[PDB]
Amino acid sequence: AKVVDIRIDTSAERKPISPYIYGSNQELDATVTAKRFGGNRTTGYNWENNFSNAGSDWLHYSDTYLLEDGGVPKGEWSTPASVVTTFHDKALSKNVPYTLITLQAAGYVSADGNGPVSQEETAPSSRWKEVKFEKGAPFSLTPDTEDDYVYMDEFVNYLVNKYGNASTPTGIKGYSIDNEPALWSHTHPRIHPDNVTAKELIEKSVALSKAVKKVDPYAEIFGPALYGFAAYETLQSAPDWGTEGEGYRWFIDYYLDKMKKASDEEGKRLLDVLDVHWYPEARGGGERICFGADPRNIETNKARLQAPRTLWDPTYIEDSWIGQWKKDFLPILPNLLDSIEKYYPGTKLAITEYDYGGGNHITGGIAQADVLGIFGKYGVYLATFWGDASNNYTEAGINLYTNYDGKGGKFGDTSVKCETSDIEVSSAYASIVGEDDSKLHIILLNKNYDQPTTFNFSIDSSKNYTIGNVWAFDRGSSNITQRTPIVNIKDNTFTYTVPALTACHIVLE
Numbered sequence: 001a002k003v004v005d006i007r008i009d010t011s012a013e014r015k016p017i018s019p020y021i022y023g024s025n026q027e028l029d030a031t032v033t034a035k036r037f038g039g040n041r042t043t044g045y046n047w048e049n050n051f052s053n054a055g056s057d058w059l060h061y062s063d064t065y066l067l068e069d070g071g072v073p074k075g076e077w078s079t080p081a082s083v084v085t086t087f088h089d090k091a092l093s094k095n096v097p098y099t100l101i102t103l104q105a106a107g108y109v110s111a112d113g114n115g116p117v118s119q120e121e122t123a124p125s126s127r128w129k130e131v132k133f134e135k136g137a138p139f140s141l142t143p144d145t146e147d148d149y150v151y152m153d154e155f156v157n158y159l160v161n162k163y164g165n166a167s168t169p170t171g172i173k174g175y176s177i178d179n180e181p182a183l184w185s186h187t188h189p190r191i192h193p194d195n196v197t198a199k200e201l202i203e204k205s206v207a208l209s210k211a212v213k214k215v216d217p218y219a220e221i222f223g224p225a226l227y228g229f230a231a232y233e234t235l236q237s238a239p240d241w242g243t244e245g246e247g248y249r250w251f252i253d254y255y256l257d258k259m260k261k262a263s264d265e266e267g268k269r270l271l272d273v274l275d276v277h278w279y280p281e282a283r284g285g286g287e288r289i290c291f292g293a294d295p296r297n298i299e300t301n302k303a304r305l306q307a308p309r310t311l312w313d314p315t316y317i318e319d320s321w322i323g324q325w326k327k328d329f330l331p332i333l334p335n336l337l338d339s340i341e342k343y344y345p346g347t348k349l350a351i352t353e354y355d356y357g358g359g360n361h362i363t364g365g366i367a368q369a370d371v372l373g374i375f376g377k378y379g380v381y382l383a384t385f386w387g388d389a390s391n392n393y394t395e396a397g398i399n400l401y402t403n404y405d406g407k408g409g410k411f412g413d414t415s416v417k418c419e420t421s422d423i424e425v426s427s428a429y430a431s432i433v434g435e436d437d438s439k440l441h442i443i444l445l446n447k448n449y450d451q452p453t454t455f456n457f458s459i460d461s462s463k464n465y466t467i468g469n470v471w472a473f474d475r476g477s478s479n480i481t482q483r484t485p486i487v488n489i490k491d492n493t494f495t496y497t498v499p500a501l502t503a504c505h506i507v508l509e
């Protein structure tokens with residue numbers, strides 16, 4: 001019999017959980033709290049006519065993909081920014097409080113939707129329009145599609161004119177400085193053939209941020225949307241890192257320090273959120289836990305359940321090149337947060353793309369629930385899962401926090417102290433609402449693969465809990481269903497046995 005003790009103190013370690021950590025990039029069968037318009041297709045997106053380029057994802061085709069995939073009504077295809085206004089309109093209609101829109105910085109955007117762009121048509125060419133951050137002339141709500149430029153501040157002006165600025169209820173709250181710059185030369189060689197330099201990225205980030213904030217001083221700027229660890233460390237061996245990086249432990253520090261320096265010179269914050277993508281490299285059963293992972297491989301599923309620990313646990317070393325060669329930078333969230341504290345205090349942290357895999361398997365659901373608990377506990381500001389609606393268990397993991405009862409019930413927004421005696425077989429996160437502990441929320445995850453786990457709970461609270469309602473998902477179904485309530489609570493202690501591989505949300509009152 002596996003027995004684990006869970007100890008919670010509702011008065012200790014109280015910290016707000018940002019409401020935006022429960023987001024997505026795609027349209028999911030889950031209640032989300034943030035929507036990001038980003039990814040490869042957004043680098044060459046032209047707001048003036050809605051065309052965009054697939055880059056290496058599909059023969060460098062310039063077409064109407066984003067209009068089609070975004071579900072934009074045909075009659076609006078020629079309307080400026082219809083891809084983005086359709087995107088934000090949808091978010092607003094779903095009561096999503098945060099919309100993050102990627103702006104273009106690689107350099108050029110699609111001039112047309114005429115198909116493949118040849119290598120001989122690498123920008124500049126008739127197939128592209130040059131991006132300029134500041135128009136330097138009066139904005140127009142009807143941008144000229146005949147000239148050679150596309151202006152980012154004019155794009156932002158169009159959105160602010162329509163929705164109000166970021167301080168208002170319907171305004172777009174954040175903008176991203178493009179997408180995965182260290183991969184521009186790989187994903188978008190027809191736009192930016194040369195490997196991005198550290199100097200170039202800072203120059204562009206500062207210039208675009210200034211341009212955006214002159215239009216909407218309340219908008220939050222997100223950067224650099226790094227694809228993965230190699231970019232975090234050296235911006236993918238940036239051509240000038242040997243010189244620019246002198247004295248810096250990794251590119252993350254250089255980016256924060258240089259953005260802080262530019263902000264100090266400008267007189268206002270130019271970087272609001274340090275933004276990175278994290279697709280785990282963790283392996284099990286001979287394969288990575290994401291990207292083509294086989295749900296039949298038990299060792300991979302088991303590795304997926306432990307992988308979230310790389311985000312916070314100093315004692316956990318995953319099986320990957322990062323776990324092997326980059327221990328100095330693990331656990332990853334504390335290292336990113338440490339860098340922020342050292343080089344640009346006050347900067348927020350966001351994970352704008354991530355996927356732990358096994359999306360249609362119970363372990364993908366449990367890992368997703370674990371990751372969200374970790375994001376909340378460690379102070380992540382915004383997070384957006386990258387993956388489609390077929391990831392039913394990932395969606396259950398999100399709904400366990402955002403809509404566990406099907407009627408809007410959600411995890412508390414204030415994290416409180418909650419410790420488990422066995423971090424390998426379980427995870428537990430607790431929260432309350434605001435400053436009130438009248439209702440105590442607990443996400444309890446049993447990672448035991450084939451045996452139930454008995455949990456002995458001990459809670460320190462100003463309230464005496466008498467009932468604990470329960471909602472959970474498991475291998476029987478990704479649908480979250482209400483379970484029999486916990487009723488024998490003695491002096492805020494109780495014992496609850498959970499079946500193998502089950503994710504629960506307990507609400508004590």
Ligand SMILES: OC[C@H]1O[C@@H](O[C@H]2[C@H](O)[C@@H](O)[C@H](O[C@H]3[C@H](O)[C@@H](O)[C@H](O[C@H]4[C@H](O)[C@H](O)[C@H](O)O[C@@H]4CO)O[C@@H]3CO)O[C@@H]2CO)[C@H](O)[C@@H](O)[C@@H]1O
Pocket residue numbers: 038039040041042053054057058061063065179180227353386
């Ligand atoms: O070209 C016409 C053709 O399009 C087909 O659909 C394509 C689309 O053109 C293409 O742009 C799209 O690309 C995806 C890509 O497949 C996906 O891997 C990638 O994911 C990246 C992400 O962008 C991140 O920034 C980072 O690198 O991590 C993630 C990976 O986890 O995003 C791209 C889009 O941004 O794929 C679709 C489907 O193949 C139509 O299907 C076809 O009918 C049209 O004729």
Ligand SMILES: [Ca+2]
Pocket residue numbers: 048129143144145146147148149150151
């Ligand atoms: Ca133009």
Ligand SMILES: [Cl-]
Pocket residue numbers: 179180181182183225226227228231
């Ligand atoms: Cl990158």
Ligand SMILES: [Zn+2]
Pocket residue numbers: 028029388389390391392395
């Ligand atoms: Zn789904």
